[PDB]
Amino acid sequence: MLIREVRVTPVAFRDPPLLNAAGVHQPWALRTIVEVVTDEGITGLGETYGDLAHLEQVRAAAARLPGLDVYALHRIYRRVADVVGANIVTDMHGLTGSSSRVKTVDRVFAAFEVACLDIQGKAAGRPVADLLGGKVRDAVPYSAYLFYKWAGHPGKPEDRFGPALDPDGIVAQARLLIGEYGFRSIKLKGGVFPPEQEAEAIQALRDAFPGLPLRLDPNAAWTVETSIRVGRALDGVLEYLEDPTPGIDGMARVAAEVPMPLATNMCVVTPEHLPAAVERRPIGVLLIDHHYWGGLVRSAHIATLCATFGIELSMHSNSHLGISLAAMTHLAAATPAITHACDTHTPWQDGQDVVAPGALRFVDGAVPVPDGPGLGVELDRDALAVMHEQYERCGIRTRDDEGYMRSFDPSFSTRRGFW
Amino acid sequence: MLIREVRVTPVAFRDPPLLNAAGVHQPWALRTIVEVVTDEGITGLGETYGDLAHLEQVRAAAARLPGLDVYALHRIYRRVADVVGANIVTDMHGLTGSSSRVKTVDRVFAAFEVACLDIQGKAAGRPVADLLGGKVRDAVPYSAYLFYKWAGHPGKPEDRFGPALDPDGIVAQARLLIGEYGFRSIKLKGGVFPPEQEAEAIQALRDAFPGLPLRLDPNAAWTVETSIRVGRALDGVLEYLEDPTPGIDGMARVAAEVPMPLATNMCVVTPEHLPAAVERRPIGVLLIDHHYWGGLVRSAHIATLCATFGIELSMHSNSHLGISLAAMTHLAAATPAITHACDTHTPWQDGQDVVAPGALRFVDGAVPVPDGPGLGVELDRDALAVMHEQYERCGIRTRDDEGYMRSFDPSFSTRRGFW
C-alpha cells in the first residue's frame, strides 16, 4: 500500500463577516485539500489551511511522499520534518497561538495523516474511529458557534444570517442556528465589544436558552484585572471561559481568581507547552485541534496526557469543510476524554463542501459517526474544481483578519490585553 | 470480526534461583496464555501473569468477551472494568509497585488487547508494529539481565548457568549471556548483597565490558542516605540507577543528589502516579511495561506523555515467553521514545516457549521485528499442552519469592530501605 501520488488542491469558499479580536473574517476562507492515492488506486482525503506559506510546504512535502507506505506514519512524519527543515510558518492573526518548528511540522503532517487513516480504514473496511479504538459514542455533540457580525461584507450582498451587534441580535442568531442544527451547547466569540456588553449577551443567552452550557471566547482581548471581574460576574453561567487574557502567566492568575474553568487554544497549542501548563495551571480545559496538534493519532495521545493531569478536552475549529468535519468526528467519537461539545464553523459555510452531501448530518446538535469505511466521505470532484477556480480568482492568498479590518478602520489593531 | 471464543490456559515453566530484594525466584514461574478466536476463525495471542487471583479475573473477563468486535478496544476495556468490578488484585512481592483499581483493570485488559491487535494485524496482513505507526527501527535492543543466583534450587539439579554470588561470578555470567545473545547493555539485579559488594560487581562489569551501558536495580532495598553514597560512588559508570529506595519522596531526594538519572518500575506504575512524578521528579527514566500499563496502545500513549515531560523510556520485564517477547518487540520497534535497551528474562527460560522457534531470535543483542502478519508468532499447541500439564502439578499457584526464601532463612524479610 505504497503511495503513488498525492494531489494538492487549494480552494476558497464564501465566509460571512464574522468579527473577532483580530478584526473580521474576509469574504473568502482558504483551505488545502489533499488526496493520497496508493499504487492500487485506493484514495484518502485530508484537509488543512490554505495560507500561501503553508500551501507551499504541503506541496513540497506531498512531492516527497510517493514510495512510502500508508501505515508508515512515523516515517511519513520524519519525511515531512525533513521537508519543512528550518521553515517556521507563522500566521497573521495569532488566534491559534504562537508558531514553532514542531507546530509547523504537525500542521503539514496532519493533512497527510488523516488521508493515510482514510486509506487504512478503506483497506480494512472499517471507519477511522475503529483505528482509534472504536467509537465510544454514536454521535459527537457540537456547539453553536455564535459571532457578532455585520449584515454582509461592505460592498457585497448581505447574507441570510443577519447582523448581530448586541444581545438581541446574538440571541436571534442562536435561535436561527439552534433551530437548524439542534445544538445543545452555545459559544460566543468575544473580544469585539466592551466586555460588559459581551457579558450582557451571555446573560441574554442564558435566559433564552435555560439548561444549555455557555462559553465565551475573547481570544486574549482582556487584561488580567478585567478577566477576573468578568469571570466573577458570570459565576455559575459559563461551562468555561476561553482565553480571556494573553499568556500562560496571565491565564494562570485569572484561573486562580474566577469560579469557572479556563480553556485555551492560544497558550497551549503544541506539546512543548504542556509541562509549563501543568506547572502553572492556566487551564482546566484544552481545545485540541488535529490540524495543528499533528493528526488524529497524536491528538488522541494528547487527550490521554490531558486526562492524566485532570485537564479536560474540547475541540477548536477554524472555517472548514466536510473532510475536516469527518476527521473531527471520528477523532471525538473514538476518544474517551473528548467529553465537551466540539466547536465547528459548519453553519457559517452554508452548505458549501467538496464531499457528497449525505454522509455528515447534524441530528439534535450532534454528528453521527459516518458508517462507510475510512472517513466515510466521498470527494465530489466537480465541487473541488468549483472551489479551486474560486481560489484562483478570489484575490486572497493568506488569511488577514486585521488587515481586512484596517481597510475600514485604519486605527484598528488586534485586541490583546486591550479591555 | 466478532470474538467467538477466548481460550485461557495457565502454564508453568522452569526458572533458576534468581535472587532479588524479595527473596529468590521459585522453581516454577507462572503465566496465563490467552487465545482469542473470531467468528471466522482468525486467532490472536496474549500473555499475562499466572497468579491465581489474576488468572481468575482473566477467566471471568474472557467469558464475557464473545460478541464484541476486535477493533472495539474501548468497549472491551469497559467490559473488563465491569468484570473486575471492585476487585483489586495484589501480588506478594511488590516488585512492580502498588496495586490499584486501574492497574488491576489494565493488567486484565492487556492480555486481550495484545490478542486483538494480533488479529487486526492478521486481517490487514501487517505486523502489529504497523498498527502503532510502523517500525522506526528494524530490531529492538535488549539488555543482559544479570542476577546473583544459587547454583540450583536446593534439593534439585543444578542448572547450566552456574552460581553467581560475587563480582567474578557476575562477570562470568555476563560473558555467558553476552556470548550467546550479543547483548550490548547490561543490568544487574541488586538488593541481595550489601551495597558495597554490588557496587564492586558493577565496577568489575565496567572493566570487563568497556563501552557497554550498565544499570543497577536494588528494587528499593536501600535508604536514601545509602542510595546517595552509592550513586556518587558510581559517578560516570551507570546509564541509570533503578529503584534504589522506596517511594516517590525518597526517590526524588536521591535523584537530586546523584549524578546519573534514576529509573523506576515501582513508584510509577500506573497513570495516576504521573502527576506526582512530574512534580517531584523521582525519575529521569520510566520502565514501561504493557503487562500492567494496559496493553500496547496505552503504553504508546504513556510513552508520548513521558517524552513530553522529558522522562525517557526503557522497558521492565517479568519471566515471560514468546508471545510477550513478540508484543514487547512490536511495541518498542514502533514507539519513537523507547530509546533505551529493553529488559528481558528470556535467557533464563533457556528456550522454553509456547510459540514456534524461528520467529524471534537475538542478533547482536537485538530482536528483529518479526515479518509475519500480526505478532508474527504461531502457537505450538503441543508445547502449550506440555506447559499446562506442568502448571497442573507444579504445586505453585501464586508467586511468592519471600515465602520461598523464608523456607531456607526463616528470619528473611523483603529488603525495603534495609541497607
From TrEMBL, chains A, B:
Q: Which reaction does it catalyse?
A: D-glucarate = 5-dehydro-4-deoxy-D-glucarate + H2O
What's this protein's name?
A: glucarate dehydratase
Question: Where does this protein come from, organism-wise?
Answer: Thermobispora bispora (strain ATCC 19993 / DSM 43833 / CBS 139.67 / JCM 10125 / KCTC 9307 / NBRC 14880 / R51)
* Annotated binding of Mg(2+), by residue: 217, 242, 265
Enzyme Commission numbers on file: 4.2.1.40
- Principal EC category: lyase
Q: Where are the transmembrane segments?
A: none
Q: Which UniProt keywords apply?
A: Lyase, Magnesium, Metal-binding
Which lineage do the record's taxonomy fields give for this organism?
Bacteria, Bacillati, Actinomycetota, Actinomycetes, Streptosporangiales
